[PDB]
Structure formats: C-alpha cells, structure tokens
Amino acid sequence: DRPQKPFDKFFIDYIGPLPPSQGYLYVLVVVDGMTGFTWLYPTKAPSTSATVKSLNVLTSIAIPKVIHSDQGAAFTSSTFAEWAKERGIHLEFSTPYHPQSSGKVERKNSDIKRLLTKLLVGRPTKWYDLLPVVQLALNNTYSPVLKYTPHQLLFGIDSNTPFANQDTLDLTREEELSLLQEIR
Amino acid sequence: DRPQKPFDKFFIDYIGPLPPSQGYLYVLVVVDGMTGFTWLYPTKAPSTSATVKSLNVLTSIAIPKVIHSDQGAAFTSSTFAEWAKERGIHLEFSTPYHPQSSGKVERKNSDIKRLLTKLLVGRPTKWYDLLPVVQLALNNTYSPVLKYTPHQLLFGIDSNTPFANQDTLDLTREEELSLLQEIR
Amino acid sequence: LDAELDQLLQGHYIKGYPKQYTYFLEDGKVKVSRPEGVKIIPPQSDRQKIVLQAHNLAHTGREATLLKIANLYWWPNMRKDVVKQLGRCQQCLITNASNKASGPILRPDRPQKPFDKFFIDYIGPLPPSQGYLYVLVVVDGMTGFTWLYPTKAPSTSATVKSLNVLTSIAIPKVIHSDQGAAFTSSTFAEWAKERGIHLEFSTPYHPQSSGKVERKNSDIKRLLTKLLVGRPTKWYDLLPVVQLALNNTYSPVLKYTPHQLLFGIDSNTPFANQDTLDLTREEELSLLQEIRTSLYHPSTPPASSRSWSPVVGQLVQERVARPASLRPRWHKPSTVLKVLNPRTVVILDHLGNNRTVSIDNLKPTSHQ
Amino acid sequence: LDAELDQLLQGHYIKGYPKQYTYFLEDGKVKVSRPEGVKIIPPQSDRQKIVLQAHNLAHTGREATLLKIANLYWWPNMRKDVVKQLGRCQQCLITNASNKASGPILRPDRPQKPFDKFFIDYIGPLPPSQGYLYVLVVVDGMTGFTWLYPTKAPSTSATVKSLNVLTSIAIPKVIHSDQGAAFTSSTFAEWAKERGIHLEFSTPYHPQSSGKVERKNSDIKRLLTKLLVGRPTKWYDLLPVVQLALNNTYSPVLKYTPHQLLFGIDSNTPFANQDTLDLTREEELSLLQEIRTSLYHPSTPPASSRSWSPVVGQLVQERVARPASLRPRWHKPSTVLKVLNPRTVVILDHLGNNRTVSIDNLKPTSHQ
DNA sequence: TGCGAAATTCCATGACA
DNA sequence: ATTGTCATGGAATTTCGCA
DNA sequence: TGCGAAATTCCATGACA
DNA sequence: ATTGTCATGGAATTTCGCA
Ligand SMILES: CN(c1c2c(c(O)c3ncccc13)C(=O)N(Cc1ccc(F)cc1)C2)S(C)(=O)=O
Ligand SMILES: CN(c1c2c(c(O)c3ncccc13)C(=O)N(Cc1ccc(F)cc1)C2)S(C)(=O)=O
Ligand SMILES: [Mg+2]
Ligand SMILES: [Mg+2]
Ligand SMILES: [Mg+2]
Ligand SMILES: [Mg+2]
Ligand SMILES: [Mg+2]
Ligand SMILES: [Mg+2]
Ligand SMILES: [N+]
Ligand SMILES: [N+]
Ligand SMILES: [Zn+2]
Ligand SMILES: [Zn+2]
User: Where is it localised (chains A, B)?
Assistant: First the structure.
C-alpha cells in the first residue's frame, strides 16, 4: 500500500446556520486528509447548488481523488453525484448517525468550530471578513503528531505568516458571559 | 560672364480680366527665362495680395534670383518689395510703356495669350479646369531656336506627355464667328 | 491494435517495440517496464483519442502535449502521433503565433527618371489648422522631391484637386499608393486613366511597400514638430516652408538634395551650390544624367537564421487584419498559387479568391 | 576673426590654415582656392551665425548641415563648430530619435520560494461577460502558479476583494506590479501594510518589468481564444478551466508544471504524474526542494553592437509618455544621479524630481 | 564501437494593452 | 526606489537499439 | 613613406497611423 | 496583381598636411 498524499481525500462538511454576515449563513469546510489543510467557503444555504459553486472554486486549484462527507442532503443528491462523476472524483459517505474521518481531521474540525465560536462572539456578524485570517491561523498551526503545519506539508516551505502565539482557543470569563447574553 | 540658367530670372505678368471661372478672373503668368517653362496661377485680382499668395506656391518649389515685370501696381507696391527682399529675390522693372523681356519670353507670352484665347472660345467660363493642360502643352512645345522643350531643359529628361501634334493655334472660321458672337 | 499487442505479450517481436523490454499484463491492460517506470501501452485504435485528450487540456504544442501523455503511456513514435494532431487542430493553427521570420526585404531599383513613379500617402489627422486636418504627401521615386497639400479629409476628391495642381508641372508614368480609401475608389481610377497614369497598389496592410513616402512622412513630422516647439500647433502656414526645407536638404549618403536630383542646379535658396556656374545648361544636364545613374543603391540584407520563403502550393495563412478581442490572429490555411517575388505572393483563400499579399502578413502552416 | 585673417592674407602661417593653399581677397571677402573650388573664409566671429543658419534650414544633423556650409565656405575644423551647435539646439535634442540601443536585458533570479513574490496585472477590457470586463491575474514568481479573478473594473477595490480571497491560502512576501491606477492608490498601499506585504513597482511605462505576469497574460488570452473559436465570447465561465488548464501545463524547458512546482505532486487531473507514488510525503517534499533549486535559469543576452550603458552624471533624456500630435517624443536633458543596475537608473529631471526609470525609456543626450 | 533513427535539447520568433 | 519571459516547432545534437 | 589628426564613410537604430 | 527607406551621430577607415 502507497503512502498518504495531499489531494488523496478531501473531507467536506457544513457549519451553520450562523448569524448573517454579508448575506452569508454557512461555511463549507474542506480539509485535506493527509496535510490537514483547510479551505473555507461562505454560503447562503447547505444546498447542492452552493456546494457545487464553492467546490468549483477549489477544484479549479486542485482536484481530490475522493471527497468524504456525511449523508447531508446537499452531498447525496444526484446533481452532486453528476458533478463528481464529471470530474473523476469518487464520492464517499460515512454511515448515517456515525460520522468518521481520521484523528487528524476530527481534531481539525474541532479546532475550526472552537476558533469560529471564539472570534464570532463580540462580533457575530463580522465573520465573513475574518474567514481569511481564520484559514491562515488553522493552516499555520503546528501538528503535535507530525512535526509540521498544514502549510508546510502542502507547499514544502515555511510560511510568511507563522502563528507563534499558540492561542488559548478557550472563551475567557467575559466571553462566556457575552455568549450567554447574545443567546438571550 | 556665366551661362544662362533656370531660376536666374522669372518673368511675371497678369492676363485678364477674363470671364469668371470658379470665381477667378486673372492668370498670373510666370516664365522661366532660360528654359521658357511656364507656371500659371488663377487669381481674383491683379493685386499684390493675390500675387504674393500665388508666388508663395511657386517659391515653395523654386526661388528665382530675379523677378522681372512691368510697372503693374501689384508689382511696384512696397509690400511686394518687402516680400521679395525677405526672400533674397531682386526685383527688376521694364520702363513704363516699354515692355522688354527676351525673344524667347516674348514668343512664349504670345503663345500663352493665343492658346488661352483659342480654348476659352466655345467654353469661356471653363478655363480654370484647363490651366493644367495648357501648361503641359506650353512646356512640352518644341523650341525652334533650341533643340528642346522647356520640360527637357528644366528636368533634363523626355516627358511622359509629349505634344506631337504641333497645333494650329489659329482660330478656325467657326471660332472667329463664335468669338465675335460672345463679344456681342 | 489488439492483435499486435497479443503477439507482443506471447514474447514475439513486433517492429518498433524494442525486444529488450518485458511486456506484461496487469488490470486488463498491456504494460511495459521502461527506464522511467511502468507505462501502459494502449492499442493503436485508442492512441488518437489519448493524444487528443492530452492536447485539448490546454491546446499545448509538441513537447507539452507529449509530457502529459508520457506520464501514463508509452508506444512507438509518440511524437509522430502528437504532431499529426497538431496539424489537424484548427484552433491551434489559427490562434498560435509563427516562429519563423520572413525572408530578407527586397530593395527595389530606384525609378530611373524623375516622374517615372510617384509614391503618395496621407498623414493625419493632425491638430486642426485653418480647418485642415490632413496632408497629402507626394514623393517622386527617383529624386525624393516632395509636394505637400493640406486637406480636410483623406478623400479622393481632395486627392484629385491636389494632383490636378501637381500634374500641371509633369504627368508621372506610375502612381504607387497603399490601399487607403482615397486611392482605391473608382473615381480615382478614372482620374488616372484619363491621364494615362498607371495606378500601382501596395499589398494590403503593409506600409513598408509605400516606404519611399512613409519615410518622408517621418521627416515631415519631425521638422514640423521642431518648428512648433513652444508654439501652438498651427502647421498649415508651415507646409510650404517644410516642403522647400526638405526638398533642399542633403542626403548624406547620396551627397545630393532632392532639388538637385530634379533640376541639376540649386535655385535661389540659402547656401546654394555653385559648382556648375561655368557649365552650359547642356553640360550641366549632361552631368546630371551621369549623377542620376551612379547613385548608391542598397542590397538585400542577410536572411535571419530562421526565415521562410514561399513555394508554390505551400499551405500558408494570412494574418487577420483587425482581429476582434479574443479571436484568432490568423485566417484558415490557404495555398500559394504564384510566387511573384520572394516577398510577395498570390494565394487562394479557400472560399476563395486570389489575393496578392505580402509575405509579412503570412505564416507557413505548421506541421504541413 | 579679422586680425587672424589679416596675418593670413600677408602670407604668414596661422595654425590650422594649411600653408600650401593661396589665400586671397575678392569683393571685400577673404577667399581660398581648395580642390573642390573657391570658398569664402569667414571671420571667426561670423562662423557661429553661419553654422546656425545652415542648421536651421531643416534642423539637419552633422553631415547634412556641413554639406550646406561647404557650398560657400571653408574654415578649420568645420564639423567641430557644427557639432557644437547640434549639442545646443534644444529642438533637435528633444525631437530626434536615438540611434543607440539599450544594453542587454537582465534576467533577475527566480524567486527562491513559492510566495516569495507575486506578479499581478490586469487584462482588459474584454467583451462583456456576465457584467465582467477585466481579469486580475496573479502569478507566483517561483512556480508560475496563476490565479485568475474576473472584475468589472481594474480598480483597487476589486483588487483588494480578490486578494483577500487569494491570501486565505498564503500571504506573499512581496507583490510586484506595474503603475496601473489600482496598484498605486494609497488604499492598496494600506491593504498591503496591514498584512506585512511589501509592494514593489515596475519603472514607469516598462511592461517588460512585469514580464512574469505579462507573459502569462499571453497564454491566458491564447487559450481563451482557442476555446471560444466559433462561439460567442462568453469567457467568464472559462476562467476557472483556463486557470486549471495552465497551472497544469508543462513548461518544456523546465519539465515541470506550475502545479508540480507548487505542491510537488499532481492532483486528480488528467494524465497525472505518478513517479513519486512510493515516496513518503516527506521524501517527496525533499525531492521537491531539490527540483526547485536546480531549475534552468537564463543568462543576460549579448549586447547589441551599438548599445549604451548609463554612467553617473551623464546627460540622458526620458521619453515623453503620451506625446501629443506634432510634439517632441523626448523630455529636456536630465542627469543620472544613481545607476541602480545596468538597466535601471535614478535621474534628476531639471525641475526637478528624482525618478526611477528604465534605461529603455532613456536616450543618452547627443553631442554631450 | 559504429550505424540509422528516435528522442531530446536548442533556440529564434513573437506577443503579453 | 529596481530588473523581461516562455510556448512554440523545425534543426542540431544526443541517445537508443542493435550488432 | 610614415605619422597624428581631420575628413569622410560606414552602418545600426528607429520611425513613417 | 507586386517589392522598405533613409536621417542620424559615434566608430572605423581613409585622406590630408607635412616631412
Ligand atoms: C494602419 N496602417 C496604415 C499605416 C499607414 C498608412 O499610411 C495607412 N494608410 C491607409 C490605411 C492604413 C495605413 C502608415 O503610414 N503606417 C505607418 C508605418 C509606415 C512604415 C512602416 F514601416 C510602419 C508603419 C501604418 S496599416 C498599413 O494597416 O498597418
Ligand atoms: C500601455 N502600457 C501598459 C501595458 C500593459 C499594462 O499591463 C499596463 N498596465 C497599466 C498601465 C499601462 C500598461 C501591458 O500589459 N502591455 C503589454 C506588454 C507586455 C509586455 C511587453 F513586453 C510589451 C507590452 C503594455 S505601457 C506599460 O504604458 O506601454
Ligand atoms: Mg453535514
Ligand atoms: Mg502687367
Ligand atoms: Mg496611407
Ligand atoms: Mg503612411
Ligand atoms: Mg497593467
Ligand atoms: Mg499587462
Ligand atoms: N526592381
Ligand atoms: N537578481
Ligand atoms: Zn489545439
Ligand atoms: Zn535643430
């Protein structure tokens, strides 16, 4: 069996609804399985249509052999299947109610949700503009298991934006109080 | 004493009034003394102004050392003198009532008047358009005294419009009758 | 195809499949172990589709297409099949640039006599001056003697008016022009026929062919510019001065001014030459004829190391004249009917008409 | 002047008037009998006016001015006085063309790493497609990897929107652009400062300086044209295909695609290369680092036989950028303050500011 | 240890407003 | 303060397959 | 029968929409 | 059925002035 590579498998999933930001409501999350690299795309709906439009952007940069998802409606539609067939991409579904990725991906998806939650509170409506800085953060975050960031594994170089301050990622006492106020 | 050359002396004089042609009434006649080459310019008046404007055309092709004329008003004006001084052209006047040129020039000026008279009758108002064909005729007319046309003496080559039919130049019986009818 | 690859698998020799490599089967596919790695040998009947798929990714040329194919496949003489497809891709043929230069320029003989050939052209639009916007420029081929006429438009009517004045002096055998609207109208053709003047046209979109007058345009504009420095661009009243100034300027290579070539003697202008003061006009016209024939004439420059020259029956393509945004710069391939000279040809378009065309507006179709 | 010519007439030797010729008087004027004929020797104090009158007839250069003067006059070292006037004629200096070529081009080192340097530029206007008219093109210096963004204008705002999306992937050290309005605005400068990105500008009116992206523009347009043949020019929906097509096209000289230089491995595209299937990612990134450093790099071409190279303190002239009809193509002479490299300099204009300028937009002032 | 042919490399040409 | 580039397809050169 | 310097010729460069 | 041209100013080459 051959070693694991970038573009071998992309793991996709939606996050949201979120509070509106420039008319956007969801984030399509794409994680490269081998490297842990994250691409985020803001959408208005978890539809096949928004998924196709967003993946068209990413797949005009690099095409995965396999896309892995849960059995979200957007991903099990025959339109999405057509889309993937057209591009020679194999689709792969986790069984209903039993989501499985890899340790690396799971932990990454975790960081994504926590980091999102953190920076939204205070400014729950300004997340669209922050998506770039979020991805840089995620992709320049050191992997305990491998000696390298996703940036490094993807491009084979150090980055020009290293994130040396490995951040708290936890909500400070104020933010817990603020987050429970916005939910009122 | 040095031999005679083109541009040594231009002989100028006006012919007219003539019947109107495209608003024109006179012909300024310029004859190169050495070669017998003729330039004709249609004018609206025998003024210094029309003379200057016409000679500006010719003198942007070649400048005579000496211009010879009678004591026409247009040629004795101080404006015309200024004009000639500006261009380093010497002015030369025949004494009043006693016009003198050369044999060659005299005969040329004769041909000009006769040829004009001939072609005007029948179409006394269409002479403006004929001035070009007139000059070609004159300048491709063989000189009995020299073995050459003015064209040949000026450019040193045969022309592409030779006038082999040395024309009658005299008015036929019809034209004498027609010319005495237009004068009625 | 399938038969050939069969005999191959059972260890026999097929021409162009080198014997020293082992050809095996794996996943229903014929393979071979080559120095760079294991490549699939597809059946002949599959090869054209492969080459085409590779080529179409980005419509790449020989090597960039080959490098895609070689990633997966091997078969005998791959580039032969690549080149075959390139020669049939209409899109590549009409979009790509040429990489072969034209053969060296001709230096046509100087017209033998003043008035043998006029070159005429328009300059403009210039800034409005007394209502005028253009200049008709007439240059005598032999002498370089030039006449200038201000016009309001580059029109036949203004061309005819101007040339009626000029041809009062002499009538030229031939007038050479480019294919400007003013020169190609039937009115202008009539005007010339009436006078026994032959009209001669440059090949289309090839201003070098009017080089004689074009080059004079340069000097005309250069002098006007210098005289207009720090003044409003009131050029109308300067045309005459410029005409006279240039007609009396020396060509350092000839040692003569256009005026001297035309008349054999300076008129009353500044710094007039006096060397023939003691000659008779006839002796002077004698020396002029001698001077006219002995003028320096340039020769055809060396060809560039990768020029092409047209051959009868060759496929060549005419450059599109005014190509629209995102449209090909070349017409479809057409054939050389006649080679008029090494820089000028007649082609059949494919519709098709005869066109006389400059080699500079042609590329030789690639891949035959 | 008059004293010198006096001693001359009475048969004495004055330096630079060769003794073997007889100098006489005639019509109040000093003369001399030279092989070509009898010429007037004017007094020194008259010579500048003569040279100037000759020169001004048509603002002629060295020989064509000399040939007029020699028609009437002789004196020692005439061309020295001719050249003196040419060097002082403001009109000739700012109107004439140069006849010295630039020194050979530099081939700057390829950026060492992906993201070290971006080259960005706009293409357009294109035919309207979904309301869009332009394309922002971003090319990574090291890899040639390219990103395309359709815009409605070549504006800072659209540049910033597009680059916020791009820099989601990585942030580049330097962004090199030309002096297009979108890149030179203070808004764009702020945007870059906010991100620690250094902005680097081409010298003005010198697109070769953005050669990396410019050259990619060519391929982008060439591919779009081929895909649009016999269809309406609906290019918007093709940008993505073109991006992917080109990023995965081989450079025949490098033997690598921009994608391979960026990632060290093909993604799931057609004809993907498989040579590193058995390597670990780490072994693969190891081979990539080696491949990146060993890429072919071109060298500075030979100089042309009549090039000039800038020297500190030299008088040079900047080409006028958009010269009006019948106006000079050159600015007044200015001085080379610093030679940044053999093809780039800083000049003081004469007003004057410091300008960093390409040698291609300079000529060396003639006659010193 | 050398031949004919295929493969690879060379590189001038031209186009990026 | 900054700097040309590189796909292209014939030709020139090297390598391959075989002996 | 040869030297230094001036004169002349050579010719690449660029621009004619 | 038509076809590049030539002013320009440094450099290269020839000629001049003298011996
Ligand atoms: C725009 N073109 C035209 C040009 C000229 C015309 O006079 C034209 N008259 C009519 C129609 C089109 C004309 C002209 O003077 N040019 C300048 C020039 C001169 C010499 C060169 F070597 C290069 C360029 C281009 S073209 C021939 O299609 O390219
Ligand atoms: C009209 N100019 C401009 C050009 C380009 C720009 O992108 C410009 N952006 C902004 C402003 C002016 C721009 C550009 O792509 N060019 C094409 C090109 C490319 C490479 C070459 F070697 C030659 C020509 C010219 S310019 C630089 O003044 O001449
Ligand atoms: Mg889901
Ligand atoms: Mg009178
Ligand atoms: Mg024209
Ligand atoms: Mg023209
Ligand atoms: Mg630009
Ligand atoms: Mg550009
Ligand atoms: N010829
Ligand atoms: N460099
Ligand atoms: Zn193609
Ligand atoms: Zn001047």
Answer: Virion; Host nucleus; Host cytoplasm
CB atoms within 10 A of CB C299: 8
Measured CA to CA, the distance from residue C332 to residue C315 in angstroms comes to: 10
**Which residues of chain A are within 8 Å of residue D164 when distances are taken between CB atoms?**
129, 132
In this complex, the residue of A65, A88, A132 whose CB is nearest that of residue D168 is A132
CATH code for residues C98-105+304-365: 2.30.30.140
Ranges for all domains in chain C classified under CATH 3.30.420.10: 116-249
Contact C35, C72 (CB under 8 A): no
And the tokens for D103? 């020194």
User: CB atoms < 10 A from the CB of C22, how many?
Assistant: 9
Handedness of CA D42, D45, D50, D55 (dihedral sign): positive
- Where are the domain boundaries for CATH 1.10.340.70 in chain C? 5-97
Give the span between the Cα atoms of C258 and A106, in whole angstroms: 89
Sign of CA dihedral A60, A66, A70, A73: positive
Closest CA to C286 of C315, C266, C264: C264
Q: Where in chain C is the domain with CATH 6.10.20.110?
A: 250-295
Sheet with D23-26: strands ordered across: D23-26, D29-34, D37-40
Residue A137 token pair: 């953060």
Say if residue D262 is exposed, middle or buried (CB neighbours under 10 Å; 0-12, 13-18, 19+): buried
Q: State whether CATH 3.30.420.10 applies to domain D116-249.
A: yes
Closest to C349 (Cα-Cα) out of C330, C328, C335, C364:
C335
Report CB contact under 8 Å: C168, B131: yes
CATH topology for C5-97 is Endonuclease III; domain 1 (1.10.340)
Q: How far apart are CA D55 and CA A72, in angstroms?
A: 87
Interface test with D, best of C38, C56, C57 (most D CBs within 10 A): C57
Domain segments of chain A as ranges = 1-184
Helix extents (H) in D177-280: 181-184, 186-193, 211-228, 239-247, 258-263
Experimental method reported for this structure: X-ray
Q: Measuring CA to CA, which residue among C347, C350, C329, C330 is closest to residue C338? A: C347
Q: Is the CB of D99 under 7 A from strand G?
A: yes
Instruction: Report CB contact under 8 Å: D243, A61.
Output: yes
| Cα–Cα distances in angstroms (integers) from residue D37 to residues C150, C269, C280, D41, D50, in the given order | 41, 20, 18, 12, 19
Nearest by CB: D114 against A6, A157, A161? A157
- The CATH superfamily label for domain A1-184 reads Ribonuclease H-like superfamily/Ribonuclease H (3.30.420.10)
AA letter at A134: V
Which ranges of A26-77 does DSSP label H, i.e. alpha helix? 48-58, 73-76
Closest residue CA from atom 5 of ligand 1: C207
State the Cα–Cα distance between residues D15 and D360, nearest whole angstrom: 44
Asked: is C250-295 a CATH 3.40.50.720 domain? The reply is no
3-class DSSP assignment, residue D228: helix
- Return the closest-CA partner of residue B46 out of B82, B71, B21: B71
Structure tokens at C16: 């162009």
* Distance of CA D103 from the midpoint of ligand 2 (Å): 21
Question: For the packed helices D44-58 and D62-69, what is the interaxial angle rounded to 10 degrees?
Answer: 120
CB distance A19 to A75 below 8 Å = no
